[PDB]
Amino acid sequence: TSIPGEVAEQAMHWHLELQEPAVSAATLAACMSWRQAHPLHEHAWQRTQVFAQRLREMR
Amino acid sequence: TSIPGEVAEQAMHWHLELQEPAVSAATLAACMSWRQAHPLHEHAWQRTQVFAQRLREMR
């Protein structure tokens, strides 16, 4: 099951912010706020983790 | 003000665990253990709190 487009774009943006070597506390605060704003955000966050992880294991 | 990636992610996870309406005593002991395991964890925990609070005010 697919993630609505605009949620997918936010999910991507927040996952990438968190792959930086360093992350500010402000970015962290904003990420958490996005994840908590709507169950779809949190679901998309988690699914993206799983798939990013699976992709790394293949590559 | 820079938190390394893997510490930022743990910080976020424990902060989110503590925003649940009910928290288990186990989760609590685990959160404490992380915060106490390394001064960077505790620093990340504090900064994150400062920024999550500033954020709630702006929403």
How is residue B15 written in tokens?
Answer: 């902060």
Rounded to whole angstroms, the Cα distance separating A46 from B1 reads 26
Instruction: Please give the residue range of the domain that contains residue B18.
Output: 1-59
- Tally of structural domains, chain B: 1
How is residue B49 written in tokens?
Answer: 């709190």
Resolution in angstrom units = 2.2
How is residue A6 written in tokens?
Answer: 């605009």
Query: What is the distance in angstroms between the Cα of B1 and the nearest Cα belonging to chain A?
Result: 6
Q: Please answer yes or no on whether A21 and B9 come within 8 Å at the CB atom.
A: no
Rounded to whole angstroms, the Cα distance separating A11 from A13 reads 6
Q: Is A22 on the interface with B (CB under 8 A)?
A: yes
User: In chain A, which residue's Cα lies nearest the Cα of B52?
Assistant: A29
Answer yes or no: are the C-beta atoms of B27 and B17 closer than 8 Å.
yes
Rounded to whole angstroms, the Cα distance separating A42 from A35 reads 5
Closest Cα partner for A28 from B46, B34, B21? B46
Q: Is B31 on the interface with A (CB under 8 A)?
A: no
